[PDB]
Design an enzyme around this catalytic site. Sequence first.
Site, PDB file in Angstrom:
ATOM      1  N   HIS A   3       0.807  -1.209   0.000  1.00  0.00           N
ATOM      2  CA  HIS A   3       0.000   0.000   0.000  1.00  0.00           C
ATOM      3  C   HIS A   3       0.842   1.261   0.000  1.00  0.00           C
ATOM      4  O   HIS A   3       0.516   2.212  -0.723  1.00  0.00           O
ATOM      5  CB  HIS A   3      -0.953   0.007   1.200  1.00  0.00           C
ATOM      6  CG  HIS A   3      -1.971  -1.086   1.154  1.00  0.00           C
ATOM      7  ND1 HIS A   3      -3.268  -0.880   0.732  1.00  0.00           N
ATOM      8  CD2 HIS A   3      -1.871  -2.408   1.431  1.00  0.00           C
ATOM      9  CE1 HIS A   3      -3.929  -2.024   0.771  1.00  0.00           C
ATOM     10  NE2 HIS A   3      -3.106  -2.965   1.196  1.00  0.00           N
ATOM     11  N   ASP A  12      -5.699   5.828  -0.154  1.00  0.00           N
ATOM     12  CA  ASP A  12      -5.874   4.414  -0.418  1.00  0.00           C
ATOM     13  C   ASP A  12      -7.365   4.086  -0.342  1.00  0.00           C
ATOM     14  O   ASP A  12      -8.084   4.576   0.534  1.00  0.00           O
ATOM     15  CB  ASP A  12      -5.056   3.595   0.577  1.00  0.00           C
ATOM     16  CG  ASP A  12      -5.049   2.113   0.251  1.00  0.00           C
ATOM     17  OD1 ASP A  12      -6.150   1.525   0.162  1.00  0.00           O
ATOM     18  OD2 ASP A  12      -3.949   1.542   0.071  1.00  0.00           O
TER      19      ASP A  12
END
Length: 433
Positions: free
Chosen positions: A14, A110
């Site tokens: 991520h 994200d």
Amino acid sequence: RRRIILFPVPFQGHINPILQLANVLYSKGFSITIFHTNFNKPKTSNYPHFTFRFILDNDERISNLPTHGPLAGMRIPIINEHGADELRRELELLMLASEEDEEVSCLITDALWYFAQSVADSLNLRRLVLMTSSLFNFHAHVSLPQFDELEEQASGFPMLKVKDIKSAYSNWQILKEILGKMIKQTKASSGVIWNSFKELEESELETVIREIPAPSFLIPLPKHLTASSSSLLDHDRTVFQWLDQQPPSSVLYVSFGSTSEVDEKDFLEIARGLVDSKQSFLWVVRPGFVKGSTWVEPLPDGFLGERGRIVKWVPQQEVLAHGAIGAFWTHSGWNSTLESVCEGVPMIFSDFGLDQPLNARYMSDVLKVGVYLENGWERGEIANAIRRVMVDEEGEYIRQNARVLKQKADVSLMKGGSSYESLESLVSYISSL
Ligand SMILES: O=c1ccn([C@@H]2O[C@H](COP(=O)(O)OP(=O)(O)O)[C@@H](O)[C@H]2O)c(=O)[nH]1
């Protein structure tokens, strides 16, 4: 004259794609602030051109959790359900303190930070979402109600088998809820950036166009820059002097990502499959990988022999590009998968559930750039897979597909390529927010 705020999820896989994006957007004239939790923070001195702000864990509350296992990332739900006030506080600080002629164009989050959407709405701040998994994967999520009403060829998804679905979505009240808020809020976002390229997932574009009313943009971030500056572990860089001694295409790279864990029964079986393949191998085993041990303690000595080497961590994409690499045995995390694709390296796929089974099956049976190993871990099957991808003439077509796929990824960044025009739109779009 235009700053972008980027807030990643603090796990590699991520952090890596979001900092790749930020670097790219930096390449196009934007200023960059990164909002990050202190937990799992990257080395900010690698980003002199970024401003870092540490938030949401500094004055702790419910986040005094463990730092290393399958129960960190309990931070994800906690922060999603409790971080909104601090996030708004911090964003408002930054917008106060800029401006002379510096607006903040948007916030890119994200996709897992679904709480960010209402925060940004509350500040009249456009929010963009970054997906860290594939379009195919989104195509299976936003079809997880036909699956529920009900072993091989999944109905309405010939790509997949039932084994695939029932291993992917095997914790399904566990993440049912947060998987859906995720989708809910990226639909409601102002734009979605996908880490792939059109010719990689052509079959999946229609779903994304019809499910997500916001604009999508497909950018293969690993073709722009590797993720090395955002490594949370230290690179064992000695591997390259060893790779320089090998003939071309004759080393198997082996690595199951940043978070997986296997029990000793299986760790020793993987070793023997490696030795049994009689191929040279560079094996990354993260300390933590094995049930019983700290690093690689249940391993005997010299067991790998003259052909095997083991390390804790490498700069993975750079290794995948060294000419000694002939194949990549991977847990099928989307970043690893995209990196191997972008460097033209065929794969042997294992998996640990959760998009990984679907990545493996798509690369295995759709693009045909690797062999899907998982019916378990077995020495001879492992050796057969390694050799069919690396040596057998039977597998010449997989090696050839891998090379062409990389060329397709190269061409997409050229003028009039899918990825080029996608990025060109993205910059244009953000500049009008
Ligand atoms: O020794 C290693 C192992 C992995 N990686 C990087 O870690 C990331 C892992 O992301 P992925 O989605 O593949 O796996 P995850 O850890 O999320 O399951 C990839 O970019 C790899 O290049 C690395 O830099 N060095």
